[PDB]
């Protein structure tokens, strides 16, 4: 692949939400970039904005 930071290989990122009472199971015989934990999820009034304005 195009050399980037000296490497021409890549990592492809994925996500999996696990609802309470559920269970996560990872199975792989190679090429896994394992998770370390989980981020907590909230529903609120948040969002993101692309801007170059000085705060």
């Amino acid at each position: 692949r195009p050399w980037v930071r000296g490497l021409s290989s890549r990592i492809s990122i994925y996500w999996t939400i696990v609802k309470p009472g559920d269970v996560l199971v990872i199975n792989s015989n190679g090429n896994l970039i394992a998770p370390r934990g989980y981020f907590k999820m909230r529903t609120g009034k948040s969002s993101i904005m692309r801007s170059d304005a000085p705060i």
């Binding site: 009034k45 948040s46 969002s47 993101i48 692309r50």
Partner: protein, 175 residues
Amino acid sequence: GLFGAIAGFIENGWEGMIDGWYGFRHQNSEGTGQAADLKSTQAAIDQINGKLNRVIEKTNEKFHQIEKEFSEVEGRIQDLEKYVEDTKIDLWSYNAELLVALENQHTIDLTDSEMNKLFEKTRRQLRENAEEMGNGCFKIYHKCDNACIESIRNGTYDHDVYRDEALNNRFQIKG
């Protein structure tokens, strides 16, 4: 406007009347004078302020929505994402345009109405003591000093008190 008083039977307006929106001007034996009507002035102001409230400061609150600017060409979804927003903005722009149009037509006809109302309030007070010139003026057919003129302005004018005098002049004889 619909009422034909302002920019109609009332020639022009008074830049001189700065204490009200509507009022009177008069000329009697001793002189001239002028004074603003508070009532009609407040009716107009009040209605326009009510109207102004409904419009002003009533914003929704929105947080995370869809994206609206794009870095790369994508196709089917971004087309749709753009169509949704574009469609939304035009319907809202129609909404704004129409509101100002209807609102403004309404404010104009309304304030026209309040002028004319004053006129009919005064016309009715003056009974058979006055005749209308048709330029917004009543020709009072009897002596009316500034106190008399004021009684009219504050609606306490008693037309029975000046009836015989008025009638007489309105219907004088060539003799």
